[PDB]
Amino acid sequence: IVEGSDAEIGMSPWQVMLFRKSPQELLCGASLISDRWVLTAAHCLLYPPWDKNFTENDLLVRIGKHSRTRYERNIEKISMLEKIYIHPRYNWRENLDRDIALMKLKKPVAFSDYIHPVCLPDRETAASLLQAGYKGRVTGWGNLKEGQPSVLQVVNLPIVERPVCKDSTRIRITDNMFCAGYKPDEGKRGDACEGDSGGPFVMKSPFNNRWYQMGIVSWGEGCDRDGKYGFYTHVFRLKKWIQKVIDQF
């Protein structure tokens, strides 16, 4: 996260860390959507251009963390994966279209003051909240600049109109993505950056006071560059696929 700040304790209880067993390294962020289901970006697990193709056994999911490196005894819980589900039409060849994946945990995780799931939006919530100008919140342990932070970082960013997102890049953008960030003259800055992938972009509903996950950190070109924006997977647009997987498995 660029231009963010240290998160408060328990501020993002659905935040999950995708950790590689060997070598031990932070692969991506992710989010807890239930006692046994984790949501992340499909490219965190499969990306042929960089020779990335992880299997269940190559990963660990750490939940309830704040410090990036420390093993938080009595606070964080570690789970192993039973199965990974990548969207069948995830487009790694061109623009990371449908960059979404579900991960089923071996055993349900017990909730605590530091571990609690986020809500997935419904058509109504998606419609009323996903509008240009409205701010969401992104969290992660990724790069602080285009090194890494000691604890979870947070940054609030405004959703940008689709035309503006399209005209800022040469990449073909789809209905399954949205972009966020401040424009060059707005005076404020901030962005997600490498290491933040898979993390949640959330918004707090003013109707029922709940936090909903509207996006997944997907991609960008550089970090916090003027006239450039971060791109996120549109969670609601892919909710049908999400439900289908959870119902079948």
Partner: peptide, 27 residues
């Protein structure tokens, strides 16, 4: 069911340092 309600904030009626910025943008 209890999704999106944080034990240390919503459940105690305590708000975090920047959540107001989000609500203030939902005009």
């Amino acid at each position: 069911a209890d999704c999106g309600l944080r034990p240390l904030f919503e459940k105690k009626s305590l708000e975090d340092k920047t959540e107001r910025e989000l609500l203030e943008s939902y005009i």
